[PDB]
Short mmCIF file of the C-alpha atoms (twelve columns), coordinates in Angstrom:
data_MODEL
# 
_entry.id   MODEL 
# 
loop_
_atom_site.group_PDB 
_atom_site.id 
_atom_site.type_symbol 
_atom_site.label_atom_id 
_atom_site.label_alt_id 
_atom_site.label_comp_id 
_atom_site.label_asym_id 
_atom_site.label_seq_id 
_atom_site.Cartn_x 
_atom_site.Cartn_y 
_atom_site.Cartn_z 
_atom_site.pdbx_PDB_model_num 
ATOM 1   C CA . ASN A 1   42.210 26.347  10.596 1 
ATOM 2   C CA . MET A 2   38.538 25.825  9.849  1 
ATOM 3   C CA . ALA A 3   39.487 25.653  6.160  1 
ATOM 4   C CA . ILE A 4   42.093 22.936  6.781  1 
ATOM 5   C CA . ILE A 5   40.460 21.066  9.684  1 
ATOM 6   C CA . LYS A 6   37.211 20.206  7.986  1 
ATOM 7   C CA . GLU A 7   33.858 19.358  9.796  1 
ATOM 8   C CA . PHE A 8   34.840 15.457  8.613  1 
ATOM 9   C CA . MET A 9   38.259 14.448  8.910  1 
ATOM 10  C CA . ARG A 10  40.107 11.068  8.436  1 
ATOM 11  C CA . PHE A 11  43.205 10.087  9.915  1 
ATOM 12  C CA . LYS A 12  45.838 7.246   9.269  1 
ATOM 13  C CA . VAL A 13  47.966 5.807   12.324 1 
ATOM 14  C CA . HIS A 14  50.816 3.196   12.833 1 
ATOM 15  C CA . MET A 15  52.135 2.320   16.154 1 
ATOM 16  C CA . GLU A 16  55.373 0.584   17.027 1 
ATOM 17  C CA . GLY A 17  55.529 -0.757  20.669 1 
ATOM 18  C CA . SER A 18  56.482 -3.241  23.005 1 
ATOM 19  C CA . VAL A 19  54.632 -4.453  26.379 1 
ATOM 20  C CA . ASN A 20  56.779 -6.572  28.767 1 
ATOM 21  C CA . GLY A 21  59.509 -7.177  26.058 1 
ATOM 22  C CA . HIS A 22  56.784 -8.519  23.262 1 
ATOM 23  C CA . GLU A 23  57.170 -6.066  20.429 1 
ATOM 24  C CA . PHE A 24  54.521 -5.501  17.919 1 
ATOM 25  C CA . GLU A 25  53.115 -3.194  15.193 1 
ATOM 26  C CA . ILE A 26  49.480 -1.766  14.811 1 
ATOM 27  C CA . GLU A 27  48.224 -0.031  11.601 1 
ATOM 28  C CA . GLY A 28  44.868 1.993   11.441 1 
ATOM 29  C CA . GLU A 29  42.583 4.265   9.989  1 
ATOM 30  C CA . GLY A 30  40.018 6.274   11.596 1 
ATOM 31  C CA . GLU A 31  37.013 9.014   11.088 1 
ATOM 32  C CA . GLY A 32  35.095 11.244  12.794 1 
ATOM 33  C CA . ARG A 33  33.618 15.287  13.371 1 
ATOM 34  C CA . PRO A 34  36.648 17.400  14.982 1 
ATOM 35  C CA . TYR A 35  34.290 20.009  16.060 1 
ATOM 36  C CA . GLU A 36  31.614 17.306  17.343 1 
ATOM 37  C CA . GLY A 37  34.337 15.698  19.489 1 
ATOM 38  C CA . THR A 38  33.460 11.967  17.910 1 
ATOM 39  C CA . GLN A 39  35.438 9.483   15.900 1 
ATOM 40  C CA . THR A 40  35.661 5.696   15.146 1 
ATOM 41  C CA . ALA A 41  39.343 4.122   14.934 1 
ATOM 42  C CA . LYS A 42  39.433 0.635   13.014 1 
ATOM 43  C CA . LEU A 43  43.067 -1.007  13.965 1 
ATOM 44  C CA . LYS A 44  44.716 -3.991  12.910 1 
ATOM 45  C CA . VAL A 45  47.937 -6.016  14.589 1 
ATOM 46  C CA . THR A 46  50.154 -6.080  11.854 1 
ATOM 47  C CA . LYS A 47  53.024 -7.607  13.758 1 
ATOM 48  C CA . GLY A 48  53.572 -9.748  16.746 1 
ATOM 49  C CA . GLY A 49  50.127 -10.767 17.279 1 
ATOM 50  C CA . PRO A 50  47.862 -12.004 18.968 1 
ATOM 51  C CA . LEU A 51  49.245 -9.530  21.507 1 
ATOM 52  C CA . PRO A 52  49.548 -11.406 25.045 1 
ATOM 53  C CA . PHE A 53  48.284 -8.515  26.891 1 
ATOM 54  C CA . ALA A 54  44.899 -6.454  27.405 1 
ATOM 55  C CA . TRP A 55  43.898 -4.324  24.124 1 
ATOM 56  C CA . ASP A 56  42.915 -1.654  26.682 1 
ATOM 57  C CA . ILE A 57  46.146 -0.338  27.601 1 
ATOM 58  C CA . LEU A 58  46.619 0.452   24.142 1 
ATOM 59  C CA . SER A 59  43.109 2.184   23.258 1 
ATOM 60  C CA . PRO A 60  43.643 5.368   24.461 1 
ATOM 61  C CA . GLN A 61  46.859 6.001   22.470 1 
ATOM 62  C CA . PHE A 62  44.522 5.712   19.496 1 
ATOM 63  C CA . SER A 63  43.638 11.639  18.505 1 
ATOM 64  C CA . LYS A 64  43.148 15.268  19.902 1 
ATOM 65  C CA . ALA A 65  42.272 17.160  17.100 1 
ATOM 66  C CA . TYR A 66  38.764 15.652  17.528 1 
ATOM 67  C CA . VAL A 67  37.768 17.351  20.958 1 
ATOM 68  C CA . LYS A 68  34.694 19.725  20.651 1 
ATOM 69  C CA . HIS A 69  35.457 23.091  22.299 1 
ATOM 70  C CA . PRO A 70  33.567 25.975  23.450 1 
ATOM 71  C CA . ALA A 71  34.031 28.791  21.457 1 
ATOM 72  C CA . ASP A 72  35.713 30.615  24.402 1 
ATOM 73  C CA . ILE A 73  38.340 28.021  24.838 1 
ATOM 74  C CA . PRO A 74  41.200 27.992  22.550 1 
ATOM 75  C CA . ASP A 75  41.580 24.792  20.539 1 
ATOM 76  C CA . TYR A 76  45.477 24.584  21.032 1 
ATOM 77  C CA . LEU A 77  45.491 21.390  19.096 1 
ATOM 78  C CA . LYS A 78  43.405 22.295  16.155 1 
ATOM 79  C CA . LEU A 79  45.334 25.509  15.971 1 
ATOM 80  C CA . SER A 80  48.621 23.430  15.730 1 
ATOM 81  C CA . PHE A 81  47.567 22.612  12.090 1 
ATOM 82  C CA . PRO A 82  48.978 21.768  9.535  1 
ATOM 83  C CA . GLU A 83  52.289 21.369  10.838 1 
ATOM 84  C CA . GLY A 84  50.434 19.634  13.900 1 
ATOM 85  C CA . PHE A 85  51.747 18.757  17.444 1 
ATOM 86  C CA . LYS A 86  53.652 16.085  19.540 1 
ATOM 87  C CA . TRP A 87  52.404 14.212  22.798 1 
ATOM 88  C CA . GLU A 88  54.244 12.486  25.197 1 
ATOM 89  C CA . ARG A 89  52.463 10.200  27.826 1 
ATOM 90  C CA . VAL A 90  53.343 8.547   30.768 1 
ATOM 91  C CA . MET A 91  50.720 5.814   32.822 1 
ATOM 92  C CA . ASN A 92  51.552 4.618   35.856 1 
ATOM 93  C CA . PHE A 93  48.939 1.571   36.693 1 
ATOM 94  C CA . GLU A 94  48.435 0.828   40.546 1 
ATOM 95  C CA . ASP A 95  50.469 -2.370  40.390 1 
ATOM 96  C CA . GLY A 96  53.512 -0.775  39.157 1 
ATOM 97  C CA . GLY A 97  52.799 -1.445  35.578 1 
ATOM 98  C CA . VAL A 98  54.241 1.558   33.402 1 
ATOM 99  C CA . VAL A 99  53.520 2.832   29.846 1 
ATOM 100 C CA . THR A 100 55.233 5.172   28.164 1 
ATOM 101 C CA . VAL A 101 54.052 6.792   24.778 1 
ATOM 102 C CA . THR A 102 55.495 9.266   22.365 1 
ATOM 103 C CA . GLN A 103 53.274 10.382  19.122 1 
ATOM 104 C CA . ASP A 104 53.354 12.576  16.342 1 
ATOM 105 C CA . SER A 105 50.490 14.225  14.743 1 
ATOM 106 C CA . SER A 106 50.947 15.944  11.170 1 
ATOM 107 C CA . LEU A 107 48.304 16.728  8.455  1 
ATOM 108 C CA . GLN A 108 49.466 15.227  5.135  1 
ATOM 109 C CA . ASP A 109 47.267 15.061  1.902  1 
ATOM 110 C CA . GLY A 110 44.263 16.292  3.602  1 
ATOM 111 C CA . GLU A 111 44.298 13.603  6.338  1 
ATOM 112 C CA . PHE A 112 45.963 13.632  9.600  1 
ATOM 113 C CA . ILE A 113 48.751 11.099  9.931  1 
ATOM 114 C CA . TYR A 114 49.593 9.609   13.653 1 
ATOM 115 C CA . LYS A 115 53.125 8.097   14.163 1 
ATOM 116 C CA . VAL A 116 53.050 6.504   17.802 1 
ATOM 117 C CA . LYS A 117 55.731 4.692   20.003 1 
ATOM 118 C CA . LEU A 118 54.820 2.897   23.062 1 
ATOM 119 C CA . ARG A 119 57.080 1.294   25.917 1 
ATOM 120 C CA . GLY A 120 54.897 -0.997  28.118 1 
ATOM 121 C CA . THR A 121 57.219 -2.259  31.605 1 
ATOM 122 C CA . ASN A 122 56.847 -4.133  34.692 1 
ATOM 123 C CA . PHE A 123 53.445 -5.760  34.217 1 
ATOM 124 C CA . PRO A 124 53.167 -8.487  36.896 1 
ATOM 125 C CA . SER A 125 52.800 -11.896 35.109 1 
ATOM 126 C CA . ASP A 126 49.764 -12.579 36.850 1 
ATOM 127 C CA . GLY A 127 48.000 -8.929  36.883 1 
ATOM 128 C CA . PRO A 128 45.145 -8.006  34.736 1 
ATOM 129 C CA . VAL A 129 47.041 -6.508  31.789 1 
ATOM 130 C CA . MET A 130 49.039 -9.832  30.941 1 
ATOM 131 C CA . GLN A 131 46.231 -12.026 31.962 1 
ATOM 132 C CA . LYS A 132 43.565 -10.266 29.905 1 
ATOM 133 C CA . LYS A 133 41.119 -9.497  32.327 1 
ATOM 134 C CA . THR A 134 39.993 -6.056  31.705 1 
ATOM 135 C CA . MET A 135 36.657 -4.737  30.447 1 
ATOM 136 C CA . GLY A 136 37.123 -1.482  28.746 1 
ATOM 137 C CA . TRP A 137 37.393 2.291   30.723 1 
ATOM 138 C CA . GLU A 138 35.175 4.111   32.650 1 
ATOM 139 C CA . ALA A 139 34.354 7.752   31.120 1 
ATOM 140 C CA . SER A 140 37.526 9.948   32.026 1 
ATOM 141 C CA . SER A 141 37.871 13.618  32.935 1 
ATOM 142 C CA . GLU A 142 41.075 15.107  31.704 1 
ATOM 143 C CA . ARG A 143 42.122 18.246  33.631 1 
ATOM 144 C CA . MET A 144 43.861 20.504  31.219 1 
ATOM 145 C CA . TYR A 145 46.332 23.436  32.046 1 
ATOM 146 C CA . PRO A 146 49.127 25.238  30.184 1 
ATOM 147 C CA . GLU A 147 52.331 24.876  31.489 1 
ATOM 148 C CA . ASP A 148 56.117 25.731  30.113 1 
ATOM 149 C CA . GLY A 149 54.824 26.619  26.522 1 
ATOM 150 C CA . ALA A 150 52.641 23.322  26.261 1 
ATOM 151 C CA . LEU A 151 49.260 21.756  27.285 1 
ATOM 152 C CA . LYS A 152 49.362 19.437  29.835 1 
ATOM 153 C CA . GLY A 153 46.633 16.688  31.058 1 
ATOM 154 C CA . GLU A 154 45.910 15.100  33.941 1 
ATOM 155 C CA . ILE A 155 43.534 11.851  34.565 1 
ATOM 156 C CA . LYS A 156 42.834 9.115   36.882 1 
ATOM 157 C CA . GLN A 157 41.679 6.607   34.550 1 
ATOM 158 C CA . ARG A 158 40.018 3.521   35.456 1 
ATOM 159 C CA . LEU A 159 39.805 0.205   33.849 1 
ATOM 160 C CA . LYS A 160 36.961 -2.162  34.516 1 
ATOM 161 C CA . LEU A 161 37.874 -5.558  35.630 1 
ATOM 162 C CA . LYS A 162 36.159 -8.675  34.790 1 
ATOM 163 C CA . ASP A 163 35.920 -10.117 37.878 1 
ATOM 164 C CA . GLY A 164 34.602 -6.655  39.554 1 
ATOM 165 C CA . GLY A 165 36.002 -3.268  40.480 1 
ATOM 166 C CA . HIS A 166 38.759 -1.412  38.646 1 
ATOM 167 C CA . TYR A 167 42.355 -1.334  37.947 1 
ATOM 168 C CA . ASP A 168 43.624 2.483   38.197 1 
ATOM 169 C CA . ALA A 169 45.961 4.173   36.409 1 
ATOM 170 C CA . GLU A 170 47.586 7.887   36.800 1 
ATOM 171 C CA . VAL A 171 48.180 9.498   33.598 1 
ATOM 172 C CA . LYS A 172 50.092 12.418  32.803 1 
ATOM 173 C CA . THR A 173 50.495 13.928  28.980 1 
ATOM 174 C CA . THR A 174 52.112 16.640  27.611 1 
ATOM 175 C CA . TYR A 175 50.705 18.042  24.149 1 
ATOM 176 C CA . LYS A 176 52.912 20.668  22.306 1 
ATOM 177 C CA . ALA A 177 52.334 22.309  18.970 1 
ATOM 178 C CA . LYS A 178 54.933 22.609  16.580 1 
ATOM 179 C CA . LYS A 179 54.652 26.307  16.242 1 
ATOM 180 C CA . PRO A 180 53.489 28.672  18.944 1 
ATOM 181 C CA . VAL A 181 49.671 28.957  18.987 1 
ATOM 182 C CA . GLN A 182 47.297 30.213  21.559 1 
ATOM 183 C CA . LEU A 183 47.110 28.096  24.930 1 
ATOM 184 C CA . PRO A 184 44.036 27.978  26.573 1 
ATOM 185 C CA . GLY A 185 43.671 28.398  30.451 1 
ATOM 186 C CA . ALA A 186 42.464 25.384  32.592 1 
ATOM 187 C CA . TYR A 187 39.554 23.265  31.502 1 
ATOM 188 C CA . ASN A 188 38.194 19.504  31.642 1 
ATOM 189 C CA . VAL A 189 37.724 17.304  28.761 1 
ATOM 190 C CA . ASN A 190 34.993 14.434  29.484 1 
ATOM 191 C CA . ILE A 191 36.140 11.546  27.317 1 
ATOM 192 C CA . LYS A 192 34.590 8.336   27.015 1 
ATOM 193 C CA . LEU A 193 36.399 5.222   24.816 1 
ATOM 194 C CA . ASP A 194 34.502 2.118   23.856 1 
ATOM 195 C CA . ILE A 195 35.609 -1.008  22.010 1 
ATOM 196 C CA . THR A 196 32.525 -1.232  19.738 1 
ATOM 197 C CA . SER A 197 34.029 -4.531  17.716 1 
ATOM 198 C CA . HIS A 198 36.796 -6.819  18.214 1 
ATOM 199 C CA . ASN A 199 37.536 -10.411 16.810 1 
ATOM 200 C CA . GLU A 200 38.301 -13.118 19.415 1 
ATOM 201 C CA . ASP A 201 42.051 -12.409 19.516 1 
ATOM 202 C CA . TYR A 202 42.007 -8.582  19.255 1 
ATOM 203 C CA . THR A 203 43.966 -8.547  16.170 1 
ATOM 204 C CA . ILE A 204 41.446 -6.516  14.502 1 
ATOM 205 C CA . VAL A 205 39.357 -3.858  16.780 1 
ATOM 206 C CA . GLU A 206 37.227 -0.986  16.298 1 
ATOM 207 C CA . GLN A 207 36.892 1.919   18.988 1 
ATOM 208 C CA . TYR A 208 34.608 4.891   19.315 1 
ATOM 209 C CA . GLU A 209 35.553 7.905   21.280 1 
ATOM 210 C CA . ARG A 210 33.358 10.872  22.347 1 
ATOM 211 C CA . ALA A 211 35.736 13.803  24.118 1 
ATOM 212 C CA . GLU A 212 33.963 17.544  24.841 1 
ATOM 213 C CA . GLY A 213 35.853 20.432  26.433 1 
ATOM 214 C CA . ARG A 214 33.990 22.028  29.197 1 
ATOM 215 C CA . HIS A 215 34.614 24.881  31.358 1 
ATOM 216 C CA . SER A 216 36.090 24.654  34.960 1 
ATOM 217 C CA . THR A 217 35.638 27.935  35.780 1 
ATOM 218 C CA . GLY A 218 33.065 30.705  34.810 1 
ATOM 219 C CA . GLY A 219 29.870 29.677  36.802 1 
# 
């Protein structure tokens, strides 16, 4: 798959979502280096803008083909191409807010194509999401393991708050290749997602992510 997943790859993304009943769409494009674990995404709100909630709850939904893997950890999600893979995520935020996401990743005309559907519910009207009081994610460690013929990841993810401290989410995601390919054992992925630019109302956003798999065992 090194022939089809090139060392530089572009993607296109579309998200349809709603948060606390506010419906929206986002379109974006991205590019990165799948074997180096880096990528940038440029997003535009195309319907429902300006969004009345924190961009930060959407940012982790905008690309696991771009994780640097040691040669001895099977890169299951790269191996899934050209057919690709799907992922499904639940985020439980500490104040009862919930985000669920489903995503399809495919490869078409030499670029990744991402289709995302998102449902955010139960965010308190005076909480940091609906009041836009967040300031980006801390670096994360996603704990990966195979289960039931798919790859699972779990994160204790932390959003920085403008007035100090953190707003926490427990996250679980299943990543499932469309064809059986080799699953890895348990390992960790170190992720750092940064908003590198945005306009005043967050209808135009650029974000950078670095993600690298590391052994959890082996000394």
